[PDB]
Symmetry: D2
Subunit: 208 residues, 4 copies
């Protein structure tokens, strides 16, 4: 189940990230603020738990989120741009790391780093700015669904119908949250209009 968000400030953040003549500082801060918005939306169907706490007027009971039951998993590198934002929504959530890279020739993705915490029974939230062909997300899920997650959610700034197709086809139980679904993918597997080479725009030097 795919879900495209329509909030005007998500569009703003997304479109603000499209602007190539912005500094890396601005891009990073924009995606972090977007990550907060995305994870916030993705957690709108979370169930709270009643717990007794202490207030200024004595003991009382209120509903709370079991922050520890949430596990964020950013795909380095771009996934990382969302992590700080995601943690602001859920400060005590665990964090898993997947080092993945797409083979620009075959368009396939491979895992070179995996440092995941105990995922069994918890709610996992994948973090990755773009969803192009879906190769990276497919390999990420493959690596994650093995630990028997309770539920897997994924957040992205933009997505290509191409990727949305396969994903929702081979991973129907996965919840996909997207800031904006773009037009298509080109001959090189880049989302159009997309964000170009965000990985390098974020932490290196963009070629555009």
């Amino acid at each position: 189940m795919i879900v495209e968000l329509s909030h005007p400030l998500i569009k703003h953040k997304v479109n603000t990230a499209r602007i190539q003549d912005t500094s890396a500082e601005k891009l990073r801060k924009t995606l972090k603020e977007l990550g907060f918005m995305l994870v916030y939306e993705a957690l709108k169907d979370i169930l709270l738990e009643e717990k007794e706490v202490r207030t200024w007027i004595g003991n009382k009971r209120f509903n709370y989120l079991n922050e520890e039951e949430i596990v964020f998993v950013p795909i380095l590198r771009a996934g990382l741009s969302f992590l700080e934002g995601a943690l602001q929504v859920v400060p005590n959530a665990k964090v898993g790391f997947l080092g993945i890279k797409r083979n620009e020739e075959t368009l396939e993705s491979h895992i070179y780093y995996s440092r995941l915490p105990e995922l069994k029974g918890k709610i996992v939230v994948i973090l990755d700015p773009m969803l192009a062909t879906g190769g990276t997300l497919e390999v990420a899920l493959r690596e994650i669904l093995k630990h028997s997650p309770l539920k897997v959610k994924s957040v992205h700034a933009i997505a290509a119908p191409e990727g949305l197709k396969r994903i929702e086809e081979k991973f129907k139980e996965v919840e996909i949250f997207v800031g904006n679904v773009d037009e298509r993918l080109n001959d090189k597997g880049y989302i159009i209009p997309g964000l170009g080479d965000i990985g390098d725009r974020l932490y290196a030097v963009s070629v555009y």
Copy 2:
């Protein structure tokens, strides 16, 4: 026009803020994150403007929020706990400051410090954790509406049906967003279950 937010994460931030035995650091951080959510929600109906920018593939037109059209107005001191969260949603928004204080004997509010930028034609978003008797918000609006704002929004973590009444009776054109409408006001004008003396809990020493 009152709107009570029902998002489970807002309820979590609010209740977390209800916890008296937390550190000032935790309270400030909690309310900063809640502020982001409250402002995010409050701008769900914001109108975007189309502008041309240079993307990685070339000049394209996308809809953007005119960040400078929004003006945040935190009521000192508590309102300040939402400022950073709000500025994350709209980084280049203008900021107005209102130094107000409630007489704990009559429960009347008075303005001691006013430093507001041009509000003429802009969307003003007032920030202040609690809306109890509505006194402080009334005085604030009284001086704000003069600048002939285009629209005035208000965000609060909690509010009492008491305050929501008068405010909506003398300022019906003002949109009031609240994380959770509490039960009532006590003998001393405090909200129940409310948050207590957050001002002192946030920057000084709580008397509870």
Copy 3:
């Protein structure tokens, strides 16, 4: 006791803040980061206290700062730009607020808003980007020194010699920490090269 910090990153943050064609977003972030540096430098001679804590390998004794012993006092409006960064150094410090504004004819200042926590025996750290004539700091000091604080420190991005001389002359006990001591003060009481109308550049509309 005047101290002109010589750290290249402080100079950079200062000079960066001098750039007139930067967004409010960028300037606010610049100053927040500069604020962290200034307070860090201003607390280099702070005393730590031994306390027993539990580590991964059992109880142990280490030296810790008594965070609640420090009080940050931002002078609205400009001084608020330091508050966020100042709190990163000392998260649980107390926060006092002073709404002061300078009379642009006599070059003297008046306090319109004062909300301070207990200051007796505490270490007060005044926050305010500029120290021009020093009229604002003087008025702030008068108001603070009455509460008998254990020590008073002040951080500024920049300052004019005439301003410094004026403060150190009457307050030989106050420690002034400045990112850079500029050239002089023009006939209007503005520091040169200075930062211009910082308050408005930060939260409203600059006239330059």
Copy 4:
């Protein structure tokens, strides 16, 4: 070139991190604020460059840091705890990623993931909470020095004497900035009193 920092606030941040009973939220925030400090100290010798800019009073010439000429390199996953803090001092620096993992039997480190921007002629700053045996850092340097960086700096909250010795013995040109030099390494290659398993304390679950 090794350098043990003595600033009380660094000591405080470092010692606060030793508190095993703190939430992941508190630890992450503490290390972020510490990372800022460590990097701030590490760039104290940084060289600035003169550039002409537009100020409120016209064009002027000031010294600035060429932010882009700086490259931060955290070692996953612990190194990530200093990233944001490090980026606060140099917002536009480039970011390199090194996925490393120590073998708990031989205490050897191996690089499974590498995503580095162009390091040739730049100032590289490695980020890693601890520096126990030196294996992780040694491997890292050997892939970084190959790019012929202008200079290499490294920051750590704590380091074991034996770790510092091999490093300084194999990389005399590398500047190692340490928050506090602990006592030693145990039989399992853990620093004492050390921080335990910070990687798990930060993003997963600690066994202590």
